Subunit: 189 residues, 4 copies
């Protein structure tokens, strides 16, 4: 019933989103890579900006994700800088560096995801945000998911997303933000 | 139930949105006169941007409106330039100059309104758009309403909005978009 | 010595810049088409934005031009909208329409040009502006030049730039801005 | 011969620029604290942007500075994020955090400054950039200067700017860049 192109370069993101989409959602890969200036202050701003740039060019309904790691004792770092921080380096160096940052510090943290729907024919835009609360692990563990998942432990668990990647589908920020986006969309039709 | 501020400096817009409020919504003018640079290409971009800027400086749900007159035979002019066009001059003078532009041309026009709700607490953003098709009168009539109302005739009528302003309450771009917004809030709150 | 690419999509601007160029400059068109959202509210802001965006992507010194027609009685219209106004129509039609807007108004106008140099290796940016004061003719005449030339009369002249386009080399907004820019660069080399 | 306002919120920048002002220039703080979203990817873009905004509000010549600390082994961190990083925390906390990140890494870094002049009357804008190269110390020393001074050691010295702040006047990113700017001006004017 509703068909959408995904506004995203990230293949792990393509992956997570199709696997939690209801049957009434068809989620297609964008026919083209489109440069987006990601100069927003928040996940919401960047998510909307990707949805709008992609929507205007493709002239078809689109969905966008903007996401990252928020560490409370580091002022929300890396936040929107999640990818850009030490971007020439491996996620493993990034995680080691942030471990050094956190010695002696409260390790509370969250992955946040802003999920955006834009229909450029109707000029309807919907954006919702959700999060998964956890903590940074004392050490990098496991090879599942992507990015910072090897050192993030969701609340109510003692393993990292790198160790129990299947759990992302159930409780991660992206799963909940998009299910909450699907839910709104479902209602308004 | 739901209090909301209006992300605008326009009294006329505040009046018009105030009068169509649903029973479950409280609608207040914003307590700050915040400057937003309206550099969007489209009414949606500007709407969305006022709502984010207002919602962030206020830390409370906001609604914003970006609106204008679009005259097809003039390329959609004045469009997002509706206020900035000859801004030091009265609307009378603006309407006069646009009448000259239109001599001998198809007179078909629309008012368009991009209506956006932003909740900065949850990060929920909803933006919708509507319009009233109509045409430019051959002369300026009435004093009702505001802006271009005195020379705009909605389809199915022969008086301008400046002549029959009460009719705005029922069929205007602003009345239609904001109801479209309420019907969305209602269904998802 | 100094080679610059021009951060422009306008081949008339290219040829006009080349013909006034000092002996020590080499001026080449951009080797790549790059998209820039011209969302500045002034010429200076758009000129600087084109220079920066093209400079950063080309990794090489560049120059940009933002230019337009400013008519005083019309609040400076079309201004930054010079190109966008009625952009699907010919200039003849955009002129006819502005002729209609000028009936019974003061006819004085200026072309304005913001000329920018950007060296992205040193991060040196230099932006200078000039103008040519004149007035709008009562009709369109000449096929020379480009854009609004055929109804623009320079102060101290009888003929429009469409009739005497050869005079642009000496006295246009573009000739004066760029030579001002060449002269600043002379001193700082 | 020239009264220029400083487009800045930083009392410490105010003082350090003031003290290297050349004879023909009366450098003042700005009368008004004005909101500027520093959303640029580089120092130059933020510098330019602060200059333009202030200069449009104030209608007089202004100068702006955007500056930060660039640590090479950390991908250029904190860079444009130099203030915003851990912004609710003291600079002692920030520097302590960054020492941890640097354990086992190349300590080299630069303070960088983009110094921009903007005349909103003529529409002339000049932006130049400079840097002071140096290294992060293994410890925080001295309460001189500001920000990251107490753990930055300019090349060829053994003291942090925290310990020798009076040498900034002569060798800092800021003095060099602002003198580079001054130099360029008193050729043209
Ligand atoms: O699910 C996640 N696991 C690990 N890292 C994530 C996840 N979601 C977003 N990120 C981080 O956020 C950045 C990409 O988000 P983007 O800016 O939305 O493309 C990368 O640093 C990711 O590693
Ligand atoms: O309901 C309408 N009637 C007449 N003019 C309107 C209406 N809505 C928007 N406008 C015009 O469009 C501009 C609205 O400014 P903005 O939405 O704040 O960018 C002003 O020129 C208004 O006069
Ligand atoms: O030298 C000129 N003669 C006539 N029109 C000009 C000249 N310079 C700029 N323009 C107009 O201003 C606009 C240039 O738009 P820009 O590409 O955004 O700088 C186009 O409308 C041009 O036709
Ligand atoms: O001379 C300096 N010494 C120490 N820190 C500096 C200096 N100049 C700039 N910074 C840092 O750079 C940031 C300035 O950011 P800005 O005010 O946004 O340009 C602040 O975090 C400063 O602490």
């Amino acid at each position: 019933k509703l068909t959408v192109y995904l506004a995203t370069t990230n293949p792990h993101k393509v992956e997570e989103i199709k696997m939690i989409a209801p049957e009434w959602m068809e989620i297609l890969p964008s026919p083209e890579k489109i440069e987006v200036v990601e100069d927003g202050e928040t996940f919401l701003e960047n998510s909307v900006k990707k949805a709008v740039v992609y929507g205007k060019k493709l002239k078809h309904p689109v969905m966008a994700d903007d996401s990252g790691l928020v560490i409370y004792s580091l002022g929300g770092f890396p936040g929107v800088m999640s990818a850009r921080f030490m971007e020439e380096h491996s996620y493993k160096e990034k995680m080691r560096t942030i471990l050094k940052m956190l010695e002696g510090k409260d390790r509370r943290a969250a992955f946040v995801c802003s999920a955006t729907f834009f229909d450029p024919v109707e000029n309807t835009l919907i954006s919702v945000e959700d999060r998964v609360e956890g903590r940074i692990a004392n050490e990098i563990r496991g090879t599942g998911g992507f990015g910072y998942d090897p050192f993030f432990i969701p609340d109510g668990y003692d393993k990292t997303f790198g160790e129990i990647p299947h759990l992302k589908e159930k409780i991660s920020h992206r799963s909940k933000a998009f299910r909450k986006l699907f839910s709104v969309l479902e209602k308004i039709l």
